[PDB]
Chains A and B, each alone.
With several copies, the nearest count.
Chain A
Amino acid sequence: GLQIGTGVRPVATERLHSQGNLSQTNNSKDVAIKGQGFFQ
């Protein structure tokens, strides 16, 4: 036969784990991580 829809819902939200630009702060304890990884 035929088909009738019912609507839309949001299913998920995904983050873009890309690499952002670096800004200098001249602070000796500021760390910028290049690539992959996280501080625990």
Chain B
Amino acid sequence: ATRTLVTASTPGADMTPGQLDYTSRPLDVALQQDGWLVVQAADGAEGYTR
């Protein structure tokens, strides 16, 4: 057994918080380290975003 192929793989993501800018807009929100806002996706089930 010598041959060994390689296939690319992608884990989920990196949830490192991004840098945020102050826009002074009254309804622009920034979350916590591990916070998520919930929205209603197209299919009906809720989804999480930042």
Interface size class of B (residues with CB under 8 A): under 10
Q: List 5 A-B contacts (CB under 8 A).
A: A6-B19, A6-B20, A7-B20, A7-B22, A9-B22
What chain B residues lie within 8 Å of A9 (beta carbons)?
22
Interface size class of A (residues with CB under 8 A): under 10
How many angstroms from the CA of A10 to the CA of B19 in the assembled complex? 18
Residues of chain A whose beta carbon lies under 8 Å from any beta carbon of chain B: 6-7, 9
CB-CB contacts of B1-27 with A at 8 A, as 1s and 0s? Answer: 000000000000000000110100000
Q: Can you list the 5 inter-chain pairs with the closest CB atoms, starting with the nearest?
A: A9-B22, A6-B20, A6-B19, A7-B22, A7-B20
Write the nearest CB–CB distance from A4 to chain B, whole angstroms: 9
